[PDB]
Amino acid sequence: NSYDDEELEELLRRKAAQEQKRIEEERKRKAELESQKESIMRVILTPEARQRLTNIKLVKPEFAESLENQLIALAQSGRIKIPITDEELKQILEQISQQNR
Template sequence: MADDDLAQIRAARLAQLKQQQGGGSGDNGEEAEQRRKQESEARSHMLAQILEPEAADRLGRIRMVKESRATDVENRLIMLARSGQLRQKVTETQLKEMLASLSEHEKQSGQTMENVKVVRRGGWDDDDDLDDLLNEA
């Protein structure tokens, strides 16, 4: 299942490395675009093998709302598949759990920013100055 995809990804990466070492031909832009297209196709193919259809649909809806979140989830899924930690296709429920754990992790790492307190020094207050001006008049 993942061996064919892994071979495609490796072949694309090898071609990329050869291109970088080979120097410059005039078609670098076209070759780079073709390489990105191949990598994208290999990635899509691998995700199709990893995800059940309902989970793939949910991931597609997530991509419409927040592409960076979908990319993070895809990267994690591909990493799990490559390391052999996925024994079966990922269900929609498992995808929801993964999303919940990712959002919980983001909350924990961003929590220090939420707890910042602003302490202002006393001794200067605009309201008192305005009251003094009104009382003098």
């Protein structure tokens, strides 16, 4: 087409709406994964185990986020009894602390 200033303006306005759509879809995919993880945590941990992990996540988010993903995979496997109790979670944390701590 011409690619006169009016056509470029229209193509730039469409690019703006396409970028906003892309940002909204990425935000929704991120929220869906966070909401699925919370739903799984509520089932595979007792309320007291889930509270202890939340406390750790406040001050060491990277460590807690990795430990969560590990526990969800371990539940996926038949490696651990479900739901995971506060007592069993503390035994898992002691074994991790024996990264000489």
